[PDB]
Scaffold this active site. Structure first.
Site, mmCIF file in Angstrom:
data_model
loop_
_atom_site.group_PDB
_atom_site.id
_atom_site.type_symbol
_atom_site.label_atom_id
_atom_site.label_comp_id
_atom_site.label_asym_id
_atom_site.label_seq_id
_atom_site.Cartn_x
_atom_site.Cartn_y
_atom_site.Cartn_z
ATOM 1 N N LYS A 142 -8.554 -102.973 47.279
ATOM 2 C CA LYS A 142 -7.472 -101.760 47.162
ATOM 3 C C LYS A 142 -7.877 -100.675 47.355
ATOM 4 O O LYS A 142 -7.493 -99.405 47.519
ATOM 5 C CB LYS A 142 -6.987 -101.927 45.805
ATOM 6 C CG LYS A 142 -6.353 -103.666 45.430
ATOM 7 C CD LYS A 142 -5.666 -103.269 44.378
ATOM 8 C CE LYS A 142 -6.439 -102.978 43.283
ATOM 9 N NZ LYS A 142 -7.815 -104.313 42.799
ATOM 10 N N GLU A 179 -9.487 -95.973 35.636
ATOM 11 C CA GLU A 179 -10.317 -96.905 36.722
ATOM 12 C C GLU A 179 -11.724 -95.621 36.253
ATOM 13 O O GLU A 179 -11.759 -95.844 34.425
ATOM 14 C CB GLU A 179 -9.727 -96.010 38.002
ATOM 15 C CG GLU A 179 -10.490 -97.250 38.779
ATOM 16 C CD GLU A 179 -9.395 -98.324 38.775
ATOM 17 O OE1 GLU A 179 -8.293 -99.161 38.752
ATOM 18 O OE2 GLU A 179 -10.518 -98.940 38.998
ATOM 19 N N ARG A 180 -12.108 -96.377 37.612
ATOM 20 C CA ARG A 180 -14.202 -95.955 37.164
ATOM 21 C C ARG A 180 -13.790 -94.461 37.840
ATOM 22 O O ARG A 180 -13.736 -93.688 38.171
ATOM 23 C CB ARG A 180 -14.464 -96.667 37.899
ATOM 24 C CG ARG A 180 -14.614 -97.964 38.429
ATOM 25 C CD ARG A 180 -15.453 -98.797 39.570
ATOM 26 N NE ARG A 180 -14.951 -100.519 38.785
ATOM 27 C CZ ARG A 180 -14.126 -101.310 38.935
ATOM 28 N NH1 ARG A 180 -13.105 -100.396 39.789
ATOM 29 N NH2 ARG A 180 -14.516 -102.507 39.709
HETATM 30 N N1 ADP Z 1 -11.598 -102.569 54.262
HETATM 31 C C1 ADP Z 1 -13.267 -102.589 54.531
HETATM 32 N N2 ADP Z 1 -14.311 -102.641 55.198
HETATM 33 C C2 ADP Z 1 -15.004 -102.848 54.907
HETATM 34 N N3 ADP Z 1 -15.808 -103.415 53.892
HETATM 35 C C3 ADP Z 1 -14.171 -103.713 52.473
HETATM 36 C C4 ADP Z 1 -12.740 -103.475 52.611
HETATM 37 N N4 ADP Z 1 -12.289 -102.707 51.793
HETATM 38 C C5 ADP Z 1 -13.468 -103.635 50.559
HETATM 39 N N5 ADP Z 1 -14.221 -103.367 51.287
HETATM 40 C C6 ADP Z 1 -15.240 -104.331 50.447
HETATM 41 O O1 ADP Z 1 -14.810 -105.213 49.183
HETATM 42 C C7 ADP Z 1 -15.835 -104.319 48.187
HETATM 43 C C8 ADP Z 1 -14.603 -103.779 47.267
HETATM 44 O O2 ADP Z 1 -13.587 -102.568 47.579
HETATM 45 P P1 ADP Z 1 -12.762 -101.725 46.193
HETATM 46 O O3 ADP Z 1 -12.188 -101.098 47.150
HETATM 47 O O4 ADP Z 1 -13.098 -101.247 45.708
HETATM 48 O O5 ADP Z 1 -11.614 -103.415 45.826
HETATM 49 P P2 ADP Z 1 -10.977 -103.421 44.725
HETATM 50 O O6 ADP Z 1 -10.412 -101.894 44.312
HETATM 51 O O7 ADP Z 1 -10.028 -104.324 45.044
HETATM 52 O O8 ADP Z 1 -11.840 -103.714 43.566
HETATM 53 C C9 ADP Z 1 -15.975 -102.974 48.430
HETATM 54 O O9 ADP Z 1 -17.105 -101.839 48.111
HETATM 55 C C10 ADP Z 1 -16.644 -103.506 49.884
HETATM 56 O O10 ADP Z 1 -18.066 -103.581 50.229
HETATM 57 MG MG MG Z 2 -9.985 -100.451 42.837
#
Ligand code: ADP
Ligand code: MG
Lengths: 52, 54, 53, 161
Positions: free
Chosen positions: D4, D30-31
Site C-alpha cells: 500500500k 502510521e510509522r
Molecule cells: N511495487 C513494489 N515493488 C517491489 N517490491 C514491493 C512493491 N510493493 C511492495 N513491495 C515489497 O513489499 C514490502 C512491503 O511494502 P509496503 O509499502 O510497506 O506495504 P504496506 O503499506 O501494505 O505495509 C516492501 O518492503 C517491498 O519489499
Molecule cells: Mg504501509
C-alpha cells in the site's frame, strides 16, 4: 432605498461572486459567451470508390 | 445453356453496387446537414440559457 | 421564454436576428455524378457481354 | 506488507509531480520512519522547498505513538487543510491519506471507555456513521475538486472486517 445601490450596501460578496461567475462561465464554455458564435463547418471525407 | 442464362440474370443484377454507394452518398450528406443543424441550434441555445443561468 | 427572462440590454434580439438570417451551408453532392458515369460505363461493359453470351 | 505504501508513494511521484494543484498528505497512525522518509524524498524531489516558498504539498502527521484521540482527529486535520484549498481557492487538490483504517481503529480504542456497548468484531457502535461524517467531506463539489487516494489497511487479509 437602492438608487445608487447595486446590491444594497454589500461592501462584500464580490470576492466570491468573481469565483462563482468564473466557475459558472468556465463550466458553460471557455470563449466569450457575451457575443454571437461564428461557425466553421466541415465536409465529409470520400475516397475512390469506382471499380479499380 | 442453363449456366449462361444464369450469368445473364446475374449481369442484370450488377446494378446493386452503384445504388448502395449512391445510398451512402445520399445519407452521409443528409447526416452532416442535420448535425450542422443540431450543432447550430444547440450552441445558440446554450448562450441563451447561460444568460438565464447567470 | 427568452424575451421575458433575460435582463441584458437587447442582446437576445440580435442573437435571434443573427439566427433567422443565418444560412447554414447545405452540403452539395460532388460525388454521385461520377459514380453515375461509372454506372453508365459499366452497363456498357455488361450489355456487350450479354450480347456475346 | 502487500504494498500500500509503495503504491501510494508511486502515485504521489507520478501524479503530484505531474500536478499543479497543492497536494496534501495526511499520515494517520502510521510509522514515523515512513513519515521522515516521505518528507525527505519530497524535499529532494523539489516538491517541498525549504527556501523560496513554492512548495506544493502540505503535510499533516499523527503517527502510531500518538494517543487514540490524535490518531482519530489527524485525518480530520488533513481533510480541513485540503478543504480550505478546495473551497476558498477553487484549486484542484490531491489528498493522500495513509492509513485511513487507523482512524476507525482509533475510535475503537476509546469506545468502551466512553461507556458504549461494543458492536461486532469489537468495533464502536458508531463505526459507520463516524466513517460517514468523515468521508462525506472528502468529495468534489461545484466549488472545487479533491482527488483522494486513501490507503486502507485490511486486518489479516479479511476484506469482510
Ligand atoms: N511495487 C513494489 N515493488 C517491489 N517490491 C514491493 C512493491 N510493493 C511492495 N513491495 C515489497 O513489499 C514490502 C512491503 O511494502 P509496503 O509499502 O510497506 O506495504 P504496506 O503499506 O501494505 O505495509 C516492501 O518492503 C517491498 O519489499
Ligand atoms: Mg504501509
Amino acid at each position: 432605498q437602492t438608487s445608487g445601490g447595486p446590491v444594497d450596501a454589500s461592501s462584500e460578496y464580490q470576492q466570491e461572486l468573481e469565483r462563482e461567475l468564473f466557475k459558472l462561465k468556465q463550466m458553460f464554455g471557455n470563449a466569450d459567451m457575451n457575443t454571437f458564435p461564428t461557425f466553421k463547418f466541415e465536409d465529409p471525407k470520400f475516397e475512390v470508390i469506382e471499380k479499380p | 445453356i442453363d449456366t449462361e442464362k444464369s450469368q445473364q440474370a446475374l449481369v442484370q443484377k450488377r446494378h446493386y453496387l452503384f445504388d448502395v454507394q449512391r445510398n451512402n452518398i445520399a445519407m452521409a450528406l443528409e447526416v452532416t446537414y442535420r448535425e450542422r443543424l443540431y450543432r447550430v441550434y444547440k450552441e445558440v441555445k446554450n448562450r441563451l440559457d447561460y444568460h438565464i443561468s447567470v | 421564454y427568452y424575451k421575458a427572462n433575460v435582463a441584458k440590454a437587447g442582446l437576445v434580439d440580435d442573437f435571434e436576428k443573427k439566427f433567422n438570417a443565418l444560412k447554414v451551408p447545405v452540403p452539395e453532392d460532388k460525388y454521385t455524378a461520377q459514380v453515375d458515369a461509372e454506372e453508365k460505363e459499366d452497363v456498357k461493359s455488361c450489355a456487350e457481354w450479354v450480347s456475346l453470351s | 506488507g502487500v504494498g500500500k505504501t509503495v503504491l501510494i508513494m508511486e502515485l504521489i511521484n507520478n501524479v503530484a509531480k505531474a500536478h499543479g494543484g497543492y497536494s496534501v498528505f495526511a499520515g494517520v497512525g502510521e510509522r514515523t520512519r515512513e513519515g521522515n522518509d516521505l518528507y525527505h524524498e519530497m524535499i529532494e524531489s523539489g516538491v517541498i522547498n525549504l527556501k523560496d516558498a513554492t512548495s506544493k504539498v502540505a503535510l499533516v502527521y499523527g503517527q502510531m505513538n500518538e494517543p487514540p484521540g490524535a490518531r482519530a482527529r489527524v485525518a480530520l486535520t488533513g481533510l480541513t487543510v485540503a478543504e480550505y484549498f478546495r473551497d476558498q481557492e477553487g484549486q484542484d487538490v490531491l489528498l493522500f491519506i495513509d492509513n485511513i483504517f487507523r482512524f476507525t481503529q482509533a475510535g475503537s480504542e476509546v469506545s468502551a471507555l466512553l461507556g458504549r456497548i461494543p458492536s461486532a468484531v469489537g468495533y464502536q457502535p458508531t463505526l459507520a456513521t463516524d466513517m460517514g461524517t468523515m468521508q462525506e467531506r472528502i468529495t468534489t463539489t461545484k466549488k472545487g475538486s479533491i482527488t483522494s487516494v486513501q490507503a486502507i489497511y485490511v486486518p489479516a487479509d479479511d476484506l469482510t472486517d
